[PDB]
Design a protein around this nucleic acid. Structure first.
Ligand code: BEF
Ligand code: BEF
Ligand code: MG
Ligand code: MG
Lengths: 202, 205
DNA sequence: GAATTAGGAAAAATCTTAGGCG
DNA sequence: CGCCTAAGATTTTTCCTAATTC
């Protein structure tokens, strides 16, 4: 069955590496490309799409990026099937990203044809099992974050301030402090330096 | 003249694009593709290559990533013309990189005709610097760029993991003294937030 | 000319504490 | 019950500004 696809990633050096990997398949039809949540959400109705290979960490002029952007597409577009393509190798973060309920998940640092082999696994009722059965079997199950803490820490390490994440997501510094201060105790780190060490070490 | 090119990035999907991209050019030939530092150094002598396309964010045991690495590549393999192709944007990083003298720097978050124009530029012994690159370069543009003793002394402890207050305590001075020196330093390097700073302090380690 | 040192005003962040949910 | 959410009081940390002496 002919399944049409849209792609979303901040890097066009990445996008131009996916579009070439999927045209191998004769039934696949890559209809649209985007680099931000704003232009993406705008041109979603105007283009018919069954499935989507969208990024985790992106620029969101208004409509936001990440688990925020995922569940706003899930709600306003249950029409679509979402595949999360991130460079985030971190378990603590990717933890709640699994629980989100997406079509399939693919890693950038995973072999190139991990994406076509999650376009088959979806077509017949992918690497969300291999991830979870590696993640749960890893020995970092005590460091399992919530869909908010994973969204908070992500943006902290991306190089935003606390108060800029509040402005990002519609909360107060008091709200976000708690979600980071909470997320830190889950990981068992006292300072930021030691936190970002556990957000690279993965 | 037809040149012999290498590619280096941990993300093989990025490697695929960069590999597929160089096929469009009739004189361009790719001799190698690598996923870390350790490997790039192994088959650096092995291949007859004039040019390299490398990430600053590449994993490796024996050799570092970014500045630490490019410093090794500039010295131990000097003949080679270099183009740095990274996601990264922390101006303090790119500052010290463009200081190691490379043909150019392609921001992986730039335009897709960056790398063609970057090889077209080096094909005529020049350096391409997109508006995306120019933008972040101005930050430090405004001795001067060089850090002070007590500033560098502080930054060391901040990176160690000692919070600002713990530094003041440890050295007999007020918080205001250290923040002045901490943020003074930051202002020199051309980094706003604590993240993009620590990212620099590791890139030069 | 800048380095090291701050002080008082100001901003950012953490700290209880506390209300309603699956 | 952990979860998001937050406003008090508090802390940390910057911001603005100006004193040292080389
Ligand atoms: F931008 Be994503 F994190 F690969
Ligand atoms: F994604 Be790479 F660092 F260009
Ligand atoms: Mg990205
Ligand atoms: Mg990388």
């Amino acid at each position: 069955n002919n399944m049409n696809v849209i792609i979303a990633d901040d890097h066009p050096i990445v996008l131009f590496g996916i579009r070439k990997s999927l045209e191998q398949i004769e039934w696949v039809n890559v209809v649209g490309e985007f680099e931000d949540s704003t232009a993406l959400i705008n041109n979603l109705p105007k283009l018919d799409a069954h499935v989507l290979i969208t990024d985790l960490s992106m620029p969101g002029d208004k409509y936001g990026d990440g688990i925020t952007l995922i569940k706003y597409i899930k709600r306003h577009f249950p029409s679509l099937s979402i595949i999360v393509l991130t460079m985030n190798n971190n378990p603590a973060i990717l933890s709640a990203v699994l629980d989100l309920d997406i079509e399939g998940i693919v890693l950038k640092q995973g072999a190139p044809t991990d994406l076509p082999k999650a376009l088959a696994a979806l077509q017949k009722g992918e690497s969300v099992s291999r991830l979870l059965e590696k993640i749960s079997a890893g020995g970092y199950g005590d460091k399992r974050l919530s869909p908010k803490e994973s969204e908070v820490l992500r943006l902290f390490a991306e190089g935003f301030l606390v108060t800029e994440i509040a402005k990002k997501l519609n909360r107060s510094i008091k709200t976000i402090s708690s979600q980071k201060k909470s997320a830190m105790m889950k990981l068992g780190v006292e300072n930021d330096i030691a936190l970002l060490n556990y957000l690279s070490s993965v």
